[PDB]
Amino acid sequence: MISQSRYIRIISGVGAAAPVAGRKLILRVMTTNNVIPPGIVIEFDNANAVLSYFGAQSEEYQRAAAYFKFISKSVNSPSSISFARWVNTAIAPMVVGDNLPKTIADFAGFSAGVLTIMVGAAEQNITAIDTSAATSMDNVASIIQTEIRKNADPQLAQATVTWNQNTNQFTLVGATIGTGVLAVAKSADPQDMSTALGWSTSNVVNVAGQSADLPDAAVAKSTNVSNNFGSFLFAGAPLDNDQIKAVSAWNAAQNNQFIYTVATSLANLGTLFTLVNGNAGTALNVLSATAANDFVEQCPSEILAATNYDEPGASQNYMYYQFPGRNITVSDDTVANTVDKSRGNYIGVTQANGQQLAFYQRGILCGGPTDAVDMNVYANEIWLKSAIAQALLDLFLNVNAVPASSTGEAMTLAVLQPVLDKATANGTFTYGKEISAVQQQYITQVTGDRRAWRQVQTLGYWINITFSSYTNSNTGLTEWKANYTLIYSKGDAIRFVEGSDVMI
Amino acid sequence: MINVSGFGTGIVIVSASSFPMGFSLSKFADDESPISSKELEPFGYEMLYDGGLFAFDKAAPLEVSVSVIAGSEDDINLRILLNSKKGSFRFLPGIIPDMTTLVATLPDGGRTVLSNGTILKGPAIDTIQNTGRRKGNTYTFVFGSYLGAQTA
Amino acid sequence: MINVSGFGTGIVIVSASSFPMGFSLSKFADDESPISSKELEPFGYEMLYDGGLFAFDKAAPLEVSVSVIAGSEDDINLRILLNSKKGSFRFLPGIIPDMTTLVATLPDGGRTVLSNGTILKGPAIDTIQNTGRRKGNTYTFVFGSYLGAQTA
Amino acid sequence: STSTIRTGTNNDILLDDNGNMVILRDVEACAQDVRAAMLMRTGENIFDVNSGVGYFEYIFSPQKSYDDARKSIADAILSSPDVTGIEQLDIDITGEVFGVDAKVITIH
Amino acid sequence: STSTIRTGTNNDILLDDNGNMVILRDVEACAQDVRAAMLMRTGENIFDVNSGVGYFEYIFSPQKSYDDARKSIADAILSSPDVTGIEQLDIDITGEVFGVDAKVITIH
């Protein structure tokens, strides 16, 4: 008798719901699992979705389960995660096109004249396939496989098929490895499988056979597909030193965009530190040989992802956070000093015999003398760069023209003002800190104006914009560009406490 | 020889809601002072019972007056700002709804920015003087953030 | 070039009861300002104890002043309007007796309408300066609502 | 009016050459007690919860005001049997370290 | 301190695969109960008249102030066993839709 939803609609929903728009700082995992197509990234909002897509036995489900269950000092949760594939070895071409629960065994009555068209190197067609029985989807998959094998094409002469159950896709696989391209097209035959099957209909993922590649190239391609993440990671087996060094160098090529977190043992720190001196943006974590891995390397990523940047008082310390699930690695002063000199991170135990205290101790991060070392500064710079870029693009897209005069620079200041207000309320800027003589000289050297150090001591930042002319490499013509300089006082967090008391 | 001329000064006003992109002022009235302000008074003092002196901080606003030629486009824009109603504009409160930011440039290159404030008072209709002219309209702002930009 | 001349302007005044059809003003005095007004203050501000600033909304009226040559027809019309007493006749609920409407036309073509108001002060008999002539009579109005239409 | 057992720079009983535990008289006992109280942390005293310095909630964690840490430390310095009042408290929070300085008042 | 039986997007009893009704504990029960209370409307609850939301008197009908609708909705959100206070209420009124948004506060 007509429905409530036509006049009144309440969505409800449990608390702690925070709609957000902007750059997301979430974990990205590069895996060697076969299920993930090479060219696609997937985002999940819950551990249950990951469980349904991958299954309990998978390492990825364990990683996601550990990752999601985490609470910061201000109650918050990562609320997102992303996945991507790294092909370790050469692969055959393949296709996949189903996501929706189309499979309810509707193959009955579809036996007559199966004319699915497979667009390989040369156009070829399939013959009639019996599906009236429709006993089981694996059976009909084997039937289709046999009918494909009936063809004489080199790629289809040894092709295979596979059907997964928890997720619902149908997959083809080519014969040779590392070369070849396949395609599938629908036809005018009314009873064709391709329309009913996942492939050849709307969003269908296709794969081109191609050889093995270095991990850095894989992560570069993944970024080229999308870059809405932070603090990526390699799962599975540990990588050797050379590959890690290459990835660290590639990450350092980008200027403060992501964090490279790796896992390693105590005996291995002597090698890596010499190799990866400088190369900012890389985190080293100590792993226990005896016990299970417990995924220690994810801790900075979880801490970063839990951070909210719009609300005030956002900057947080990395020195004191407790992970009950994880294990304990170091318990002595000597080993702690050696690890600190090696610039490593770990979970150190302060005691037994009572309630235990352990926490992810060093918030330091390997890098050169010029770049920031602490993690919180790195995260704040990431957020600041993102916000500045977004503001500038908004200006360019909204105003009709930006004259190369004082009005243009006034407009630029006007646009950048809200971002600086948000930053100073957030906590990435600090005020009142004392400035050393060498620091004052450095500031005056960087920007030609003197007395700017007073500005950065009082307000915490100093900005200036000028415009000039240049010529680009692609075309001999010349254009006009704007240059700004930004100097600000870095944020800090408490690590060590000094005290003293006198009786009188 | 120090050049204190005010020729070529430009001012840009941007508003949170009414004028999200902002406009510029270039036509400044002739008979009235184009821009002026009251003196900042951020410190106080009181005399002690002994005879000494004590000094302390104090809250202090900033007021700015701007005058333009009647009938210009800038007059229309500031009239829109004045007529905008604060009670409306459903928006997140506590941040001074419809915050307005002003940026002013000096001929040398000096730039100053002021935020956390809104227009306060101004005229409603034009005024005729005995000479037959129209008096230059004047508007008054107020700001809270004394952003110390005096770059060269 | 901006033409800010006031020559050629005109005023039309409509009254609810005394002058249902309205009359026109054309003879404006010389020694005193023809049309004058006070500043409009629809906004206010208050200080917090932490040093911040808070801005709110305030109710403000609008006052207008006109002056005409003594002895003209407009002077006696305004005298009748002033001498009309609000005690007599009746009114629709929440309307104010004798809601007087004023329409002013600028020479270029722009104009403005003002409503919800009435006259409130004026001269009663002529004044004579020591030079031997008569002062220009001045009258003051007040209005609650207004508008702007500056295109023609 | 107070007394306690002398301990070294580490929080262990210190014995003299003769092998005799010494009972410190007033003043010095007050210094030992206030040092121990400021070093004792919250959530550890079984049979008296909510006593100690809330380091992990009030200092190490990111905070808004820092007044709460000052109140907690001032309370911790108090509750000693002999301490009367606090004269100074600084809370430098300069550089990387969280500086603290205080001078207290005893009856004697 | 509250509990109820889970229902689906339509207001009918929802059963799991095992065929057992589930008794939701707190928090989630609060969400279900507050949704149901806001969806009830006044005038039909026998044994307690004048409880519900006056839709046809205060929202759908042409009105002067719209404050009464806000009061009625605030009351309907209250009277739940666990709800303590209301943090926000919006009442948008944009286009044809009558936007409503709220954030509720519970003991737990």
Residue numbers in the entry:
A (entry chain F): 1 to 504
B (entry chain N), C (entry chain h): 1 to 152
D (entry chain W), E (entry chain M): 2 to 109
Show me the paper's own sentences about this structure.
The baseplate assembles at the tip of the tail apparatus, breaking the repetitive symmetry of the tail tube and sheath protein, creating a unique tip for host attachment, cell adsorption, and genome ejection. The first subunit, gp33, binds the C-terminal ~40 amino acids of gp37 and gp38 that extend outward, while gp34 binds the β-sheet ridge formed by gp37/gp38, generating a hexameric ring above gp33. Notably, both gp33 and gp34 form hexameric assemblies that lack intra-subunit contacts suggesting these proteins are adaptors instead of discrete structural components of the baseplate.
Bacteriophage E217 infects Pseudomonas aeruginosa and is part of an experimental phage cocktail developed to eradicate P. aeruginosa infections in Galleria mellonella (wax moth) larvae and vertebrate models. E217 is a PB1-like Myoviridae of the Pbunavirus genus characterized by a ~66.2 kbp genome, significantly smaller than the classical enterobacteria phage T4 (~169 kbp).
